[PDB]
Amino acid sequence: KAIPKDQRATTPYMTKYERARILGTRALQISMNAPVFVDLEGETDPLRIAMKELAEKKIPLVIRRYLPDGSFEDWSVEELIVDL
Amino acid sequence: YDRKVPSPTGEYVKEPEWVLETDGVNLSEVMTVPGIDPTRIYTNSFIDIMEVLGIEAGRAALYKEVYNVIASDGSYVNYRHMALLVDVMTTQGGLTSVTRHGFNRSNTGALMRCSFEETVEILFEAGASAELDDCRGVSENVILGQMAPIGTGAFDVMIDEESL
Amino acid sequence: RLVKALEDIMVHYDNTTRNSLGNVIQFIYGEDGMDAAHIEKQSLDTIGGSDAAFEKRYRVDLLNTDHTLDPSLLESGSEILGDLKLQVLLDEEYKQLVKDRKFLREVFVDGEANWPLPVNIRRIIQNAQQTFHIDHTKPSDLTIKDIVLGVKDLQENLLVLRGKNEIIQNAQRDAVTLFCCLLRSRLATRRVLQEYRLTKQAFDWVLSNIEAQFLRSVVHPGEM
Amino acid sequence: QYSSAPLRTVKEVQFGLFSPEEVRAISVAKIRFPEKIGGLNDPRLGSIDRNLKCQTCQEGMNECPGHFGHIDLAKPVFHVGFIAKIKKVCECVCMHCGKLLLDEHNELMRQALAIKDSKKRFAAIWTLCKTKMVCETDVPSEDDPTQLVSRGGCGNTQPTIRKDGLKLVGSWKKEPELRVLSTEEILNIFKHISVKDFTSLGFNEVFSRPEWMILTCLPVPPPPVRDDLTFKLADILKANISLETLEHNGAPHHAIEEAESLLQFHVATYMDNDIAGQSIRARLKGKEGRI
Amino acid sequence: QENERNISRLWRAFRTVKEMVKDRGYFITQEEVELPLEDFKAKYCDSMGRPQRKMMSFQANPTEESISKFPDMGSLWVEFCDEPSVGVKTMKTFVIHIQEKNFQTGIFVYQNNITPSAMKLVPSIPPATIETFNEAALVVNITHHELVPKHIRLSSDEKRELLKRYRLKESQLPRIQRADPVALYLGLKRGEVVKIIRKSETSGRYASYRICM
Amino acid sequence: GLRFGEMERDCMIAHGAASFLKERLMEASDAFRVHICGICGLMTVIAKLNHNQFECKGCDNKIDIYQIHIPYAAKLLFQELMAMNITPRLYTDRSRDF
Ligand SMILES: [Zn+2]
Ligand SMILES: [Zn+2]
Ligand SMILES: [Zn+2]
């Protein structure tokens, strides 16, 4: 049922599951010749590339976190802090 | 038994005490005998504890028992795990057994692994009972070709129209 | 039989542990929101030893030529003697250490001091003491306000829950209670200065590290 | 192809029972002729012959998700799967006015009524009512057993029901009397049970009314499913039709009864092969047993 | 002989009730709670050595502190009876007394048991509820026990906040039976919620909740 | 051995590896595309794709509708349930009318 960009009580940090699903989702696109958003300083491996995009905060994706009751928060891969 | 107790100076010292170990249980009645410390009385029959002292005490005693069984082989297991077990067995106000209780459930869906060569009967009741499948299991979501709302699938991913 | 009974319990984004129906099993996982793989047995010092030992270790009385911080442990050591305003700060800390000891002696009636907790503080310090090549000869450039207020602020940053209401804020203070007891006993002023000998730089590093490791120790929603 | 219909994933599944009304409200054909004909395999249902025609929903034998058929039963028949259920409800409700045999006036009943498990509560209420053999009029209060409390005004005696194959038989008394309980009496008694009463049982006033355990309108599975089933449907049709041809031209009582128990034998065996003689349940025995 | 020690039990039990009533939020002097044996003997016995239960009964009033959260908390009427076995005639007298003098709660402390007849006499004067206890199950205050954490009754107000911030249906909360020794101790009623604060080897304290079934 | 049994699945759940679990347990059955009413969760939608027309008589529906991909073995098992007079409502929403 959505929650305003303010009032999100969920973690500002990205969960290890989100990192894995985003990296896997992005890697799949890269593996199907989908446009890339960074400078492949040699990388030719999709996942390895996707990992580079993440580090460079250039993955235009949004994670919709659901709460047990149905409501939900929306964070952008951009926002999410990546420390694991 | 040796008992670690604070000494008047502050450091823990051992204070051996006499204790009684019985064969047979009757908590409600012995607890009331004069001369004892009704505050420390115990019993490995967590069932009796839960009936005399209540579910919360029943829960603690149940943790202390599961715990002793694992510590008997010297094995160590972080609290949260046994704590979680003991809470599930306790959530409904009473001591709910783990070793398969119901012939149809324990927390599933009329969709997960069709149990019995007569799953039809599990469905028949679900129908007549207006059962509502949450679809959080791995099986029910496999039948549906979707990925379970667990771990890596406990959220949805979407395209972001913000990125410049 | 065990798997079957628990298989559907998961941690949700509200740090709650629930089952397929959405029923609450634990209001916070493990009663501390911590991930088991990030917890280490650590010694809760404040709990053992005589009282004489407790006071000798933690008591800092600026108003007493004897139970003060020797001007050698600290740079501002001689000009802090008799300082009333600071002494009020040092008494908030000591009374807090004394409650902690009482409190702990209730939770572990046994007297046992080593319990698995997140963030190995003793290690973070040993790093600091090697990273900043801290020589145990020269006095420290730490202020009493630096330590007492610093360590007081750190606690407000060790988050497990974020909800802005009163209910969740209390849940949060509870979840971090035992850990903070360990914290305050490791970063007690006399300890920092006379035992660790941290500099204002090493110390500030130790703090932000604990905050990092701590948050890195919280369980992630989605955990089966 | 393409459908403006937004794509999504199933999040929940609400199980329930198909009332005779909805079975009509959603079907396409009325299905008469037990033998393309407007009776079976076309009156709207999924098509064959590589023909796109299939209710304007065109498409083909590979995009077309079979459409459902309709088919009225001369008489109501028990659904094989709920006979055990239908029996127990009868042992809880009065078989005359449809009122639960024990109210909130009985302390042991209050405890049972509190259970939240539609399965365990049903079990508890049943174990308590199958005892009562009279739809009580007055009952002792919470005060003096000297004072009585009134309730559902119907003192009639309750029957001890037993099961004989696909029929339920009851024995009354105040030497007993034995009269088989027709599907029409049960169907009507159920429809006389209150929302509070069947809900206290494991029923849902929206998705699963007791009355629906009794089949009136049977759903005809589209081509993609049924072929043998179509045969079994054919005979169900036959038996249903020969039964109506015993009313339009009147007929003896035992004759209209042999035909009812004939249809009953098919509507039953159609869904489950496990009765007096020798299905969908079966189809699953390799679709439930193969999945 | 017996009587002597038999007196102590009734006395201990008497204590538990004071402690129990006090824990419910009724004004009671920690002083009376600690009424020494020998005084109890004098302050309540007749000249023979036997205890006169009739004399022990008493009324109890909410505390300013208590009515600030639970305004509808009337007063109590604890009651002890000389009749070892209580019959409908004896109970009616009681069920009437509490009702008459308009008491919101009556606790009946019987000795060996009551007539299954009189037992049904209980629910009969709504909303005022009546509660029963067997002295035996009062001779020791279970709440004083090691494994028994602090149970605190929540006001319907604290309850709404609870259900709201965790965003739960009442059914998703951990449960506690109506007949759970502690619920019986606190006088819990179906629907009420208790906050349980327990020590934890993990965190310092951890509060959980259980709603009465 | 060499199988992927209940115990293996439990380990993968513990790892939170859901997409691997989906990839591994799923069968061959063609991902079929069905249409559904948002009111009743049934496969009683008549789709005139070319004409953009969706109808679900019994409900008066043309706007409140969705599309889902499910193994054909599912479409069947469900229709079979409908044949046995049972209603397997499929809903895209988790938060009921509560
Ligand atoms: Zn079609
Ligand atoms: Zn009747
Ligand atoms: Zn519809």
CA C138 distance to own-chain centroid: 27
Instruction: Return the structure tokens found at E172.
Output: 């998703």
Strands F31-37 and E205-212: unpaired
Experimental technique behind these coordinates: X-ray
Q: Is A2 helix (H, G, I), strand (E, B) or coil?
A: coil
Q: Which chains reach chain F with 3 or more Cβ–Cβ distances below 8 angstroms?
A: A, B, C, D
AA identity, residue C71:
P
The strand pair at E105-110 and E129-134 is best described as parallel
The bridge status of strand B155-159 relative to strand C10-11 is unpaired
| CATH class of the domain at F1-85 | alpha beta
Q: Tell me the β-bridge partners of F66.
A: F36
**Residue E145: CATH number of its domain:** 3.90.940.20
Residue with token string 């500099």? C199
- The answer to whether E177 touches E211, Cβ cutoff 8 Å, is no
How many angstroms is it from F45 CA to the middle of ligand 3? 7
Q: Is the dihedral of CA E90, E93, E96, E101 positive or negative?
A: negative
Interface list for chain F against chain A, based on CB atoms closer than 8 Å: 16, 19, 94-95
For residues C67 and C59, the answer to whether their CB atoms sit within 8 Å is yes
* Pair (E133, E148) in one structural domain: no
Which residues 4-43 in chain D show a CB within 8 A of chain F? 4-18, 22-26
What is the rounded CA–CA span in Å between residue F80 and residue D283?
8
- Token pair of E204 as six digits: 């310092």
At residue B91, the 3 state secondary structure works out as coil
Q: How many CB atoms lie within 10 A of CB C82?
A: 12
In the DSSP assignment, the letter for residue C195 is I
Please name the residue that has the structure tokens 């009876």. E81
A24 in F contact zone (CB under 8 Å): yes
Nearest in space to D123 (alpha carbons), one of D157, D152, D84, D167:
D84
- Residue B43 burial class via C-beta count within 10 angstroms: exposed 0-12, middle 13-18, buried 19 and up: middle
Is there a binding annotation on residue D97?
A: yes
Q: Which amino acid is at B120?
A: V
Resolution (A): 2.8
The Cβ-side half-sphere exposure at D54, using a 13 Å CA radius, reads 29
**CA–CA dist F98, F90 (Å, integer):** 17
| Count of CB atoms situated within 10 Å of the CB of D168 | 21
Q: Does F59 belong to an annotated binding site?
A: yes
Write out the DSSP string of chain B. Answer: ---EEE-TTSSEEE--------SS--HHHHTT-TTS-TTT---S-HHHHHHHT-HHHHHHHHHHHHHHHHHTTT----HHHHHHHHHHTTTBSS----S---SS-SS--TTSS--SS--HHHHHHHHHTT-EE---SHHHHHHTTPPPSSGGGSEEEEE-S---
Q: Do C178 and E203 touch (CB under 8 A)?
A: yes
Please state, in angstroms and rounded to a whole number, the distance separating the CA atoms of residues D287 and D150: 53
Q: Among all residues of chain B, which has the CA nearest to that of D201?
A: B129
Amino acid at A30: I
Residue with tokens 């079966």: D282
Distances (CA, A) of D45 to B12, B56, C51, D232: 85, 60, 88, 18
Asked whether the beta carbons of residue B38 and residue E147 sit closer than 8 angstroms, the reply is no
Q: Which residue has the tokens 């919470």?
A: D142
Query: How many Å apart are CA E116 and CA E85, to the nearest integer?
Result: 11
| Together in a domain, E23 and E112 | yes
Contact, D202 vs B129, CB < 8 A? yes
Residue E127 preceded by cis peptide, ω within 30: yes
E149 and E174 assigned to the same domain:
yes
Same domain for E122 and E28: yes
The residue in chain F having the minimum alpha-carbon distance to the alpha carbon of residue B114 is F77
DSSP one-letter string for C63-125: TSSSSS--TTTBTTSGGGTT-HHHHHHHHHHHHHHHHHHHHHHHHTTT---EEEEES-HHHHH
Domains annotated for chain A, with CATH where assigned, are: 1-84 (3.90.940.10)
For chain E, how many structural domains are there in total? 2
CB B124 within 8 A of CB C198: no
Taking the C-alpha atoms of residue E128 and residue D206, their distance in angstroms, rounded to an integer, is 37
8 A C-beta contact, residue D21 and residue D14: no
Helix segments in chain D, DSSP class H: 20-26, 83-90, 107-114, 120-129, 183-190, 195-200, 228-244, 253-271, 280-284
| Rounded-to-integer distance, Cα F66 and Cα B139, Å | 23
b/e per residue, D23-51, with b = 16+ CB within 10 A?
bbbbbbbebbebeeeebbbbbbbbbeeee
* Strand C24-26 to C17-18 pairing: antiparallel
Owner of token pair 């400078």: A39
Q: What are the tokens at D140?
A: 């002792």
Cβ of C6 and B106 within 8 Å?
Answer: no
What are the DSSP calls for F20-77, one per residue? HHHHHH--SS-EEEEEEESSS-SS--EEEGGGTEEEBTTTTBSSSEEEEEEEHHHHHH
Q: How far apart are CA B128 and CA D213, in angstroms?
A: 8
Q: Which residues of C4-28 are buried (b: 16+ CB within 10 A; e: fewer)?
A: ebbbbbbbbbbbbbbbbebbbbbbb
Buried b (16+ CB within 10 A) or exposed e, E28-45: beeeeeebeeeebeeebe
Closest CA to D75 of D210, D236, D222: D236
The answer to whether B142 touches F26, Cβ cutoff 8 Å, is yes
Query: Quick one: E47 and E113 in the same domain?
Result: yes
* Beta pairing, strands D72-78 & A61-66: unpaired
Contact D157, D173 (CB under 8 A): yes
Which residues on chain F are in Cβ contact (under 8 Å) with C222?
16
Q: What's phi and psi for D177, nearest 5 deg? A: -125, 135
* Identity of residue F55: E
3-class DSSP assignment, residue D88: helix
Q: Residue E42 belongs to a domain with what CATH number?
A: 3.40.1340.10
Min distance C98 CA to chain F CA atoms (Å): 42
Phi-psi region of C222 (alpha: psi -120 to 50; beta: other; left: phi over 0): left
Paired strand residues for E130: E106
CA D134 to chain centre: 26
Give the SS3 label for residue B47.
helix
Are the C-beta atoms of residues D57 and D15 closer than 8 Å to each other? no
Distance CA A35, CA A59 (A): 12
**CB contact set of C111 (below 8 Å; sequence gap of 6+):** B4, B5, B6, B12, C47, C48, C105
The total number of residues written for chain F in this structure = 98
Distance D19 CA to ligand 3 centre (A): 14
Query: Helix A16-31 to helix A46-55 angle, to the nearest 10 degrees?
Result: 130
Which ligand does the CA of D99 lie closest to? 2
Beta strand spans in D96-166 (E): 138-140, 148-150, 160-164
Domain that holds residue E19: 3-140
Which CA distances in Å does B68 have to B72, B73, B77, B99, C113?
6, 9, 11, 19, 20
CA distance D261 to C188: 88
Tokens of C31: 């009663």
Residue with tokens 């009964």: E57
Helix (H) or strand (E) holding A63: strand A61-66
- How many angstroms separate the CA of residue B162 from the nearest CA in chain A? 8
In sequence order, the β-bridge partners of residue B41 are: none
Residue F52 falls in which region: left (phi positive, over 0), alpha (psi -120 to 50) or beta: left
Q: 25-84 in F: which are within 8 Å (CB) of D?
A: 32-35, 40-44, 46-54, 56-59, 65-70, 73, 75-77, 79-80, 82-84
Residues of A in contact with F95 (CB under 8 A): 1, 69-70
User: How far apart are the C-alpha atoms of D132 and D124, rounded to whole Å?
Assistant: 14
CB of C189 closer than 8 Å to CB of E211: no
3-state secondary structure A26-59: HHHHHHCCCCCCCCCCCCCCHHHHHHHHHHCCCC
Contact F68, F86 (CB under 8 A): no
Crossing angle between the packed helical segments E156-165 and C166-175, to the nearest 10 degrees: 70
Domain ranges of chain F: 1-85
Residues in chain A: 84
Residue B95, amino acid: L
Contact predicate C150/C201, CB 8 Å: no
Residues E124 and E178 both lie in one domain: no
Nearest to F77 by CA among B111, D8, D23, D218: B111
CA C223/CA A82 separation, integer angstroms: 18
Q: Is C100 exposed, middle or buried (0-12, 13-18, 19+ CB in 10 A)?
A: buried
Beta bridge mates, C17: C11, C26
